[PDB]
Design a protein around this nucleic acid. Sequence first.
RNA 1: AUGUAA
RNA 2: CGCGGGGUGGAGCAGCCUGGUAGCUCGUCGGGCUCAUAACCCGAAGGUCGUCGGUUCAAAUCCGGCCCCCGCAACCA
RNA 3: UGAAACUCAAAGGAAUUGACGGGGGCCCGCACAAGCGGUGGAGCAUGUGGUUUAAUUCGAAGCAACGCGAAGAACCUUACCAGGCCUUGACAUGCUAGGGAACCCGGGUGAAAGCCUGGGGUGCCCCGCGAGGGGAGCCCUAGCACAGGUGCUGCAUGGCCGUCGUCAGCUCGUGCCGUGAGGUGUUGGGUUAAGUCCCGCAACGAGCGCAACCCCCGCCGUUAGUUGCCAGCGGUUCGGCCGGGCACUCUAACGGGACUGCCCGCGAAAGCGGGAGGAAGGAGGGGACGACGUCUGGUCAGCAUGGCCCUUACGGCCUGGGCGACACACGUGCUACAAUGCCCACUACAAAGCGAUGCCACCCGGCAACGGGGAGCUAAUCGCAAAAAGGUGGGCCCAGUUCGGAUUGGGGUCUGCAACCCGACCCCAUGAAGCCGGAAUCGCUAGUAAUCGCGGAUCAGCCAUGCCGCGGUGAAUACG
RNA 4: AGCGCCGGCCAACUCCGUGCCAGCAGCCGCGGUAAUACGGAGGGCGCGAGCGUUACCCGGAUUCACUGGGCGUAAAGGGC
Lengths: 60, 357, 206
Amino acid sequence: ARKALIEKAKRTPKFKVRAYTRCVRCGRARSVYRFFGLCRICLRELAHKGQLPGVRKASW
Amino acid sequence: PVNNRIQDLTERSDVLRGYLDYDAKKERLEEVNAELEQPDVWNEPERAQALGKERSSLEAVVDTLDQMKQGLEDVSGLLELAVEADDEETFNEAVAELDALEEKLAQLEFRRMFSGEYDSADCYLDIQAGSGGTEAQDWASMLERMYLRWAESRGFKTEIIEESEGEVAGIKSVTIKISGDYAYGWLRTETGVHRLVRKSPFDSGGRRHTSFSSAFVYPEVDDDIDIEINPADLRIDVYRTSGAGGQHVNRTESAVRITHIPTGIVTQCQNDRSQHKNKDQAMKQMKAKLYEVEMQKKNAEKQAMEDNKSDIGWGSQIRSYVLDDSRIKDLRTGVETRNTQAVLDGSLDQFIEASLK
Amino acid sequence: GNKIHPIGFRLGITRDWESRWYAGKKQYRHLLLEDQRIRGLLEKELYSAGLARVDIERAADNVAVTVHVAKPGVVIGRGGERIRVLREELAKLTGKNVALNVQEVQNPNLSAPLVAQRVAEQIERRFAVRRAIKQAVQRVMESGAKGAKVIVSGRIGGAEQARTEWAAQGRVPLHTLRANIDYGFALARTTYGVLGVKAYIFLGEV
RNA sequence: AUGUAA
RNA sequence: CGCGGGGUGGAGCAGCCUGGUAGCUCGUCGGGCUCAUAACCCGAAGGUCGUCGGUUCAAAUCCGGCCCCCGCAACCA
RNA sequence: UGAAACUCAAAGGAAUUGACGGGGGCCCGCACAAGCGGUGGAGCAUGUGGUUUAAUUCGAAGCAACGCGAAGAACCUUACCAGGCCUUGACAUGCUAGGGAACCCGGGUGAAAGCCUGGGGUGCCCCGCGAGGGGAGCCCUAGCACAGGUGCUGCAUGGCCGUCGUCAGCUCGUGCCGUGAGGUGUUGGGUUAAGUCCCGCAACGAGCGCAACCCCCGCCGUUAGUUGCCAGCGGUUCGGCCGGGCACUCUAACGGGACUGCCCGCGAAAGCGGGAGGAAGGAGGGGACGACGUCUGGUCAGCAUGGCCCUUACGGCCUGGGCGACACACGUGCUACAAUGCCCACUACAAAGCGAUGCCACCCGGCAACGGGGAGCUAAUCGCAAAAAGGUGGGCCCAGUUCGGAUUGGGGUCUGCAACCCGACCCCAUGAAGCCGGAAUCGCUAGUAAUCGCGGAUCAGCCAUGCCGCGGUGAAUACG
RNA sequence: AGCGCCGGCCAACUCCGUGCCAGCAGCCGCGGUAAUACGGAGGGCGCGAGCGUUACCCGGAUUCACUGGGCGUAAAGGGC
Ligand SMILES: [Mg+2]
Ligand SMILES: [Mg+2]
Ligand SMILES: [Mg+2]
Ligand SMILES: [Mg+2]
Ligand SMILES: [Mg+2]
Ligand SMILES: [Mg+2]
Ligand SMILES: [Mg+2]
Ligand SMILES: [Mg+2]
Ligand SMILES: [Mg+2]
Ligand SMILES: [Mg+2]
Ligand SMILES: [Mg+2]
Ligand SMILES: [Mg+2]
Ligand SMILES: [Mg+2]
Ligand SMILES: [Mg+2]
Ligand SMILES: [Mg+2]
Ligand SMILES: [Mg+2]
Ligand SMILES: [Mg+2]
Ligand SMILES: [Mg+2]
Ligand SMILES: [Mg+2]
Ligand SMILES: [Mg+2]
Ligand SMILES: [Mg+2]
Ligand SMILES: [Mg+2]
Ligand SMILES: [Mg+2]
Ligand SMILES: [Mg+2]
Ligand SMILES: [Mg+2]
Ligand SMILES: [Mg+2]
Ligand SMILES: [Mg+2]
Ligand SMILES: [Mg+2]
Ligand SMILES: [Mg+2]
Ligand SMILES: [Mg+2]
Ligand SMILES: [Mg+2]
Ligand SMILES: [Mg+2]
Ligand SMILES: [Mg+2]
Ligand SMILES: [Mg+2]
Ligand SMILES: [Mg+2]
Ligand SMILES: [Mg+2]
Ligand SMILES: [Mg+2]
Ligand SMILES: [Mg+2]
Ligand SMILES: [Mg+2]
Ligand SMILES: [Mg+2]
Ligand SMILES: [Mg+2]
Ligand SMILES: [Mg+2]
Ligand SMILES: [Mg+2]
Ligand SMILES: [Mg+2]
Ligand SMILES: [Mg+2]
Ligand SMILES: [Mg+2]
Ligand SMILES: [Mg+2]
Ligand SMILES: [Mg+2]
Ligand SMILES: [Mg+2]
Ligand SMILES: [Mg+2]
Ligand SMILES: [Mg+2]
Ligand SMILES: [Mg+2]
Ligand SMILES: [Zn+2]
């Protein structure tokens, strides 16, 4: 049960509760960041790639 | 769901026509009808028995699988004639005579269970380690607990009789009392050596490792201790004692000898001065010699089990549960279920019923 | 095992982002997604050209995708034929002023992602993986780079036992921030399975 | 004190 | 029906004769130490006292009957 | 003196590189010691093993699995189970046959999915005033190729990560020694956090590591002065409130500053000890950063991917249930067992962050959860926001108690289609165990441990005592 | 027109089936799911009225060493 779900998460529900974030890149249901539309894994991949504007390795 | 409870009767009848040889019995039943028609068949009434009752033994097979292929086809047209007319009696009348054919079929499937004299005795299950080592003593324990969950499902008693836990970790031997109905019939087709192939948690460099264990199943017969002995086959001889004693040993038949006629065992006594204090002894010792011989028959039968089982060793599998690519091949028949950790939970129906043929 | 990505490690020190613009809390997500689709479409269609970098800029309602490639002609087309053909296919999805540029790749044999796709291509061509790797590192050093390192992981030669082969020359100081090192990755789909490629080129300590 | 068997 | 000694947790044994508490060792179950096991450490559970019949307020214990068990004895012709 | 049958594809000699030793030497790390606070005992939360179940989906397994993938399971999620269902499919592309297909609106049935239906109406584009044939994105039923699978293999794989280990190491080029594996360099003496550097040497160099270059905190300067700040005058309805000014503090960029530089002492040097100057000194405090390789380590359930398997089903939709079970067992935590304490009233001082059916000032209703009004704020302006410990005053007086809040009854608030399984919060009543914890065991050397609160991601809500950050108060002890 | 062989020795390589099973084998060793080592096929190599196997003899065996070996630690200096 994956592609039906990476699809069904897009489609409008019967009640607004049933809507849920999937990672728009890989389809992940867990640890989906609202700000990026991405999961923690994709977020890390792109960040290292440099394809996230302003996003950087945070050191303090 | 009723049109799926007739589809399971179509599968249970084809498997019944496959092992029972629907063709080698439709053909054999025809040659019996050709010999018994002649009025000159009662020439040696012994021969007519093994054919007239054999014809009824093949008409309980051929004719039953004919009334199951035609009777279920008449139900596939009776359930769609009550739906398109809202007729609710034609639908109570196409399942009543459908559950009677499910008993004609379930009864004829007890040609798998009625193949072993007495297949309801509260049997025992003996799992032994061997091969593999510590790995197999773990494997023997997993195979132990698996059958326990099996009996938990179909409704039996799980009283462990004898154990021997492994030295490091695991079980060397177990004896379980499967007290239930058709108990021996179910577990009978488990007698063998089950093979396990996986990464051993006990190997220093975590290698792929094979370990075996056995399961031996016998039904329940009872004590069968002592057997009755009437004096109608005993032949008690009397004579005089030998050696010291004086006059009262020269004119006295104080010694006895009890020779058992059918067994051929002899036994004497001469200890005490009385013929019947000796005859007491000679009955005593005689009971002992028969208890030895009737024991030696059973121990001879015990060695028959030992010498016909064997050997929890390599070239000796009946089923191979390999957990490193998720398969359990029962190389006897042989199914190839991919649910390894579901069979270890007790789903042996997949094997038992299919391997009673 | 361990080593961190050497480009993501130098962003805003020795290395510059590839999608450079601003967006707020309410917009960021949707812009980024289509932006990756831009990267998506072009990555396949422009492969044949020798696609090396995809810099992207945005101003209020319009976006300009500047494509670095070794063979610009293969991108633009005939006298400008496809560069126009692309811009329309592009801004169809985008829906905005999609100025599609091209830029020269001065010496592809000093562009790490380029070197990587070469070898990945080479081993789909059933080449001697060790020879490919030794070759690859030598041109990159010939072209003047102060150092180079290339590694390929997977069923090498088709072998059942996966292995890692690498080769290196000069310096490749991945711990030094001030060292400019281009990095690139290439996936080689074969009959027996996937091979991974890493290419490290040490351009200099800038 | 010990740790079999790819 | 010879005399006399026994039968008690899973095993082996104390406690009876001076009636009211059943205790010791091992084993067993839980937890620890160890990569893991044994050893070791902490804690726990466990017994119709062979039975049947009652004496006494009260029987493992006192007194009989039966059942097995070990030892001795079975001589003079 | 001295066989054979049988049996094995070796038994051996020396030397090489490692690994190990209940061998040695020299070293280091909260490893021990020296201390402080705990865990194991109680109650509860959470994860796991078992067992249970129609299903209690799956993976993780000593260190390095177990508040781990799960940074948000009532339905959704969801991969499991039961039942009701769908066959070109929820999704991709390309056809063939007959049709209009757009698109919007309803009926019945039904738990929904679906099933059986009744309607308005493709405006498109070629000839013509035109009927009308002709374009095709798009649908209906068929037939296809196909899609689809969280099904198997992490022992076929990429990528990513854990780990030894921030450990001080791992190699190459040329030369030299050896028949050869290989050694030399890389060893040795001194020094360092360090294969750090000095000296010596059949070595001479070099690469990956070490260090540095990067970020936060420390001191200071430049630029800049509201939405931030008032040292000084004015007015001051006491609210930087208004004028006014940018000194301050602050904010955020850019720089300076520390290099054993200087003095003394030891030393061949490298360096080591002490002193001054200095905000800072011997690497100033913290972060980022993880060598060749190891664990046939982890992940086919993020994703990619070879091979293998399912095609009216191992695909897909839905409703309900399950993932929350409970005789037990272990890990991680929360609250405690009290007077250096608990409670009540009043009263101060933080930082880092977040904010449009978002935060929501102030007002009213209600014991309260909250509800109803309603100002402000695209954020140094407005709000979350009360920081808590602390401080002042009062009550308690050693009592399983004004400790402790588990359990349960009842009455509600809010979210949400819906709180039976299975949410959080509020209120009244109920007021358990627990009197400091066996064997055993963990963390931490300075703003550290202990303790005290605040914010965020995820998210309708929330089972968060979890995690990631933030500051407040602030120790003990290190012979070895 | 047939016979042997195609892991290395040793010349001739891929597909399917099988899954430490069936089986191969002269030695080293193959087979426990993707086998150039088993069985089949295609393809190839070697010989050809033959091709393989078994047994035996000499050779390789410099491994009884006259040609032409050794005895400190490998087998081997007699206790003197
Ligand atoms: Mg939700
Ligand atoms: Mg045993
Ligand atoms: Mg292990
Ligand atoms: Mg006499
Ligand atoms: Mg007489
Ligand atoms: Mg032993
Ligand atoms: Mg008593
Ligand atoms: Mg124990
Ligand atoms: Mg008695
Ligand atoms: Mg021999
Ligand atoms: Mg010797
Ligand atoms: Mg030696
Ligand atoms: Mg040592
Ligand atoms: Mg420690
Ligand atoms: Mg300590
Ligand atoms: Mg506890
Ligand atoms: Mg799995
Ligand atoms: Mg949660
Ligand atoms: Mg559901
Ligand atoms: Mg692996
Ligand atoms: Mg991997
Ligand atoms: Mg695994
Ligand atoms: Mg060399
Ligand atoms: Mg060398
Ligand atoms: Mg070294
Ligand atoms: Mg060395
Ligand atoms: Mg160095
Ligand atoms: Mg200043
Ligand atoms: Mg420092
Ligand atoms: Mg560093
Ligand atoms: Mg593994
Ligand atoms: Mg549910
Ligand atoms: Mg304040
Ligand atoms: Mg306020
Ligand atoms: Mg209290
Ligand atoms: Mg007290
Ligand atoms: Mg420390
Ligand atoms: Mg929340
Ligand atoms: Mg909190
Ligand atoms: Mg041949
Ligand atoms: Mg060859
Ligand atoms: Mg094969
Ligand atoms: Mg072959
Ligand atoms: Mg061969
Ligand atoms: Mg010879
Ligand atoms: Mg010779
Ligand atoms: Mg000679
Ligand atoms: Mg010799
Ligand atoms: Mg010798
Ligand atoms: Mg001598
Ligand atoms: Mg000698
Ligand atoms: Mg002599
Ligand atoms: Zn993702």
